């Protein structure tokens, strides 16, 4: 069915991302925790469309630092760790369903599943180094942290909360842990090239593609925005 093929309209981050997308080698589907967008139905739509378009499909779920997003919004570690385990199991279940429905390998990982992967660790070390040493990069990472906390303050119905620096620096551990997949997901996973796919623009990615940092995306890595249109 070709409503499936056209389920999404793709907006590439750069012309290189467009080339990688058109090669259709691999898509990495980013599933954000504690985000109402990722219902069972939407996860199925992502995977159905991906399965029709791409040679290889992988799903990326949140790793351990997802608890930091709750701990920063006033959640004690015990409750936060529980909510994470439950959210990740929900994402895995729905993703496994749709992959199996499409005859696809159950290729699902969290961003914590790569502590023994040299590419993930070296990119992560680069991210942490420039977070410490480049105030401009640090500022952009903290803005990603602010975005993550602000959207879940609305979602979890806590819109009255001041977002403090201590909140930002706690939640930015999540940002730093996920960033290696934005920068080098294809090489971490072992595909020739890949696009990470998400439904919102990546502002820091725009700056990276404008050559504003010593942090760079790998030449075989792209980013695409998935939009749905009538
Ligand atoms: C699993 C982390 C989610 C990644 C998405 O691109 C949103 O950050």
Residue numbers in the entry: 2 to 231
Authors' own words:
The crystal structure of full-length (residues 1–232) and S33A mutant enzymes was solved at a resolution of 1.69 Å and 1.78 Å, respectively (ESI†). BtCDPS has a single domain with an αβ fold similar to other CDPS. The structure of CDPS is highly similar to yvmC-BLIC (RMSD 0.88 Å, over 212 residues), AlbC (RMSD 2.25, over 212 residues) and Rv2275 (RMSD 2.00 Å, over 199 residues). A molecule of 1,2-hexanediol co-crystallised in the P1 binding pocket adjacent to the catalytic residues. Binding is facilitated by a hydrogen bond contact with the side chain carboxyl group of the catalytic Glu179 residue and other non-bonding contacts with P1 pocket residues. The aliphatic chain of 1,2-hexanediol molecule is projected deep into the P1 pocket, which is lined with mainly hydrophobic residues (L29, G31, L61, A63, F112, Phe182, F183, L197), ideal to accommodate a leucine substrate. However, the P2 pocket is far shallower and more solvent exposed. The P2 pocket is lined with a mixture of residues (R201, W203, K204, D148, S152, A149, R153), which is in keeping with the previously reported sequence homology that suggests the P2 pocket has conserved Met, Trp and Ala residues. The side chain of R153 is projected into the active site and makes a strong hydrogen-bond (distance = 2.6 Å) with the hydroxyl side chain of the catalytic serine residue, which is unknown for this class of enzymes. Moreover, the positioning of R153 makes it an ideal candidate to interact with the 5′-phosphate group of the aa-AMP moiety of tRNA substrate.
